[PDB]
Amino acid sequence: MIRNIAIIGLGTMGPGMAARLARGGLQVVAYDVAPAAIERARSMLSVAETVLDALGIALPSAGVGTVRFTDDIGDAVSGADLVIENVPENISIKADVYRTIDGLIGQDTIVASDTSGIPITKLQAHISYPERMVGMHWSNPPHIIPMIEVIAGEKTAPQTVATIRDLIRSIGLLPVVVKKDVPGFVENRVLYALLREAVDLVERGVIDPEDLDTCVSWGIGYKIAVIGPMALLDMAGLDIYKSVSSFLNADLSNRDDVAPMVLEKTSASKFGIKSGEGMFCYTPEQTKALQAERARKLVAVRRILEGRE
Amino acid sequence: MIRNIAIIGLGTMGPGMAARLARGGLQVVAYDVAPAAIERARSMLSVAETVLDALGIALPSAGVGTVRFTDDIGDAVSGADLVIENVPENISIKADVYRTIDGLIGQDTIVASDTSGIPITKLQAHISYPERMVGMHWSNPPHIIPMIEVIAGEKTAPQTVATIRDLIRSIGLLPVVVKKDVPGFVENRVLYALLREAVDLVERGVIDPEDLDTCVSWGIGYKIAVIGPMALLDMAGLDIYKSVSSFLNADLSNRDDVAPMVLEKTSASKFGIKSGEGMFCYTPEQTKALQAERARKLVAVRRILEGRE
Ligand SMILES: NC(=O)c1ccc[n+]([C@@H]2O[C@H](COP(=O)([O-])OP(=O)(O)OC[C@H]3O[C@@H](n4cnc5c(N)ncnc54)[C@H](O)[C@@H]3O)[C@@H](O)[C@H]2O)c1
Ligand SMILES: NC(=O)c1ccc[n+]([C@@H]2O[C@H](COP(=O)([O-])OP(=O)(O)OC[C@H]3O[C@@H](n4cnc5c(N)ncnc54)[C@H](O)[C@@H]3O)[C@@H](O)[C@H]2O)c1
Numbered sequence: 001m002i003r004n005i006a007i008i009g010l011g012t013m014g015p016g017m018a019a020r021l022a023r024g025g026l027q028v029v030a031y032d033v034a035p036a037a038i039e040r041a042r043s044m045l046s047v048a049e050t051v052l053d054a055l056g057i058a059l060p061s062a063g064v065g066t067v068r069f070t071d072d073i074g075d076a077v078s079g080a081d082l083v084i085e086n087v088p089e090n091i092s093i094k095a096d097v098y099r100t101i102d103g104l105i106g107q108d109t110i111v112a113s114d115t116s117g118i119p120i121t122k123l124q125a126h127i128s129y130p131e132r133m134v135g136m137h138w139s140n141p142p143h144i145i146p147m148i149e150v151i152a153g154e155k156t157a158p159q160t161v162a163t164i165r166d167l168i169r170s171i172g173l174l175p176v177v178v179k180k181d182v183p184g185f186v187e188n189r190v191l192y193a194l195l196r197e198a199v200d201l202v203e204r205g206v207i208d209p210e211d212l213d214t215c216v217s218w219g220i221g222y223k224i225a226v227i228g229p230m231a232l233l234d235m236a237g238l239d240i241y242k243s244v245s246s247f248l249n250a251d252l253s254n255r256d257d258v259a260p261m262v263l264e265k266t267s268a269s270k271f272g273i274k275s276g277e278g279m280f281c282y283t284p285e286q287t288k289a290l291q292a293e294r295a296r297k298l299v300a301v302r303r304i305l306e307g308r309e
Numbered sequence: 310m311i312r313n314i315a316i317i318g319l320g321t322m323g324p325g326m327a328a329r330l331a332r333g334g335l336q337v338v339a340y341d342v343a344p345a346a347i348e349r350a351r352s353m354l355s356v357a358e359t360v361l362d363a364l365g366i367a368l369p370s371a372g373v374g375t376v377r378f379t380d381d382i383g384d385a386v387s388g389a390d391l392v393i394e395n396v397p398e399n400i401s402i403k404a405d406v407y408r409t410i411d412g413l414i415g416q417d418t419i420v421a422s423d424t425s426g427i428p429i430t431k432l433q434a435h436i437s438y439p440e441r442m443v444g445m446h447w448s449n450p451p452h453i454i455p456m457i458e459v460i461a462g463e464k465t466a467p468q469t470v471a472t473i474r475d476l477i478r479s480i481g482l483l484p485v486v487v488k489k490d491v492p493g494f495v496e497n498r499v500l501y502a503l504l505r506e507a508v509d510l511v512e513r514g515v516i517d518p519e520d521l522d523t524c525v526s527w528g529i530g531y532k533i534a535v536i537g538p539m540a541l542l543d544m545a546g547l548d549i550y551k552s553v554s555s556f557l558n559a560d561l562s563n564r565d566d567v568a569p570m571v572l573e574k575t576s577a578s579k580f581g582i583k584s585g586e587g588m589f590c591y592t593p594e595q596t597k598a599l600q601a602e603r604a605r606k607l608v609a610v611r612r613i614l615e616g617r618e
Binding site: 139178195196205209212219221225232234236245257 | 425426448454455456458483485486487488489491492493495496497498499500501502503504505506507508510511513514515516517518519520521522523524525526527528529530531532533534535536537538539540541542543544545546547548550551553554555556557558559560561562563564565566567568571572574575579580581582583587588589591602603606607609610611613614616
């Protein structure tokens with residue numbers, strides 16, 4: 001039974017995750033090794049609570065439903081039914097966390113990783129009772145994107161997957177079970193397939209990057225938000241998809257490595273928003289305005305997609 | 310100068326295209342070889358006008374701004390400044406249309422094709438003054454998706470591309486210039502890259518098709534509708550995209566032909582909505598309800614994406 005949740009790591013994905021879980025009635029205690037991170041998480045947490053209000057997400061009529069931050073990991077994981085490990089994408093650091101918490105939690109406590117790219121099969125080699133370790137892969141922002149991937153590693157018990165699937169559904173979120181521990185699970189595989197082709201087209205001068213974005217946002221993302229790919233195939237006709245894919249699949253980029261344009265940008269220290277320049281240029285003011293407007297649009301669009309009138 | 314538009318072909322893409330162009334102030338006369346198609350287009354046209362109202366799209370204070378259907382192609386293309394060819398995806402049929410209209414229109418009339426998969430370079434080999442032939446690739450539904458691709462063939466004059474780009478902008482739509490006549494232009498290349506991976510994951514049992522759709526609609530389409538792929542790379546960090554793509558690109562599907570599952574479905578005459586069964590199952594009632602709800606959500610979401618409050 002999962003009533004008490006500990007979150008380890010309070011960076012980008014932490015505060016919204018904590019807020020969203022507490023809003024579902026769960027008791028959440030969260031920990032980070034860096035005091036600066038815990039402080040930043042407080043402001044991130046208050047904004048997230050308001051966003052949950054704007055999404056119309058209610059506390060159920062039962063459960064603790066609170067969030068607390070602590071600088072003591074023993075305090076955080078004490079009595080936890082679920083520990084969500086949410087530390088950097090580095091297997092040595094994640095293994096450190098598992099070793100630390102292993103002696104402090106019950107052998108039937110579920111340990112979930114928010115990892116995007118490390119196989120659950122590798123992660124669970126670093127904790128006792130690997131059958132209760134599983135991938136629980138949220139998306140950014142975690143209090144706004146309602147879909148969570150649940151991924152068994154080779155040793156994960158089917159019961160572990162079902163329990164986390166059930167937890168996610170119980171608080172009104174949308175779990176998807178990923179049935180093989182493949183690189184990138186499902187979401188980021190499909191995303192990186194989209195990106196691989198988009199980057200190739202920009203790189204070889206087929207289309208300017210801002211026009212690529214207009215094209216794909218409106219022609220693809222807008223449509224797919226309302227109609228998923230399998231449903232879209234049914235709308236287009238699988239006969240049509242057969243006819244077109246018969247020659248178009250052969251012509252798509254099959255790049256096996258990093259695109260030259262991406263190597264060029266990163267070599268020049270152009271990393272995107274974080275450095276003020278990537279594919280596009282940003283001022284600090286524009287960045288703030290863009291972040292606010294994207295969060296606002298995401299919230300409004302989600303309510304429509306959920307059927308709200 | 311483009312004031313008078315003829316549309317040849319009034320199937321799925323025709324009525325909404327005609328309505329949207331007329332709403333921009335243009336005079337539109339449309340033709341179809343099949344009387345049954347012209348009749349169906351009338352009901353499709355009236356619904357489209359209401360959708361344009363719901364989108365808050367106004368007639369400008371000048372221009373003819375009307376739609377008329379005719380069963381005489383000479384009548385339709387008379388005095389046309391732009392003929393949009395919108396007939397089946399079959400180069401012999403498109404060539405027939407170009408031969409028919411060539412003697413009936415000015416040598417400076419622009420002839421645009423709505424083709425998805427036939428190279429503009431091939432199409433323009435079948436009309437006089439190929440420099441005024443261009444791709445103008447709309448998306449379904451054409452009165453709702455605001456983005457249109459403009460594609461030069463090898464012989465297309467840059468002026469032709471600029472004139473159609475300008476026409477699209479002038480009525481409040483979003484043109485994107487595709488700078489090479491590559492298979493699938495940009496939109497359907499990126500879409501088919503997404504689909505190739507999604508189909509592969511369903512086919513090899515990584516995820517159930519309805520869960521694939523939940524995953525991709527919410528994790529990818531929802532996000533990309535608000536934030537285009539190049540902008541999204543900037544948010545994630547190009548350093549991160551470099552690190553991840555360095556191993557993940559190598560693992561993506563590079564399928565060169567039709568997926569076995571798609572061959573299986575089509576062999577069994579399971580084509581999707583049109584036959585009542587494809588990836589999913591549909592009743593006639595469900596189909597109608599789904600079509601209405603998807604159109605309603607598309608309209609509401611678009612207004613948010615455009616910044617409406
Ligand atoms: N888009 C995203 O950012 C995103 C989305 C889904 C999943 N993820 C995954 O979630 C995990 C965290 O991602 P993030 O973007 O939130 O990272 P982040 O770098 O923003 O935050 C990581 C946090 O972990 C803390 N930390 C480091 N070592 C620790 C330890 N031993 N104990 C406790 N805390 C420690 C850091 O101080 C930092 O606050 C990664 O595995 C990442 O792949 C990220
Ligand atoms: N999603 C889509 O359906 C979509 C989107 C963008 C572009 N397109 C492209 O637009 C074109 C039309 O697509 P559609 O889906 O509207 O096709 P459709 O089959 O729904 O309609 C084709 C119409 O052309 C008519 N026609 C056939 N021969 C003709 C002739 N000689 N003169 C005049 N009319 C004739 C038919 O009677 C029919 O009404 C195709 O090239 C297609 O690839 C389709």
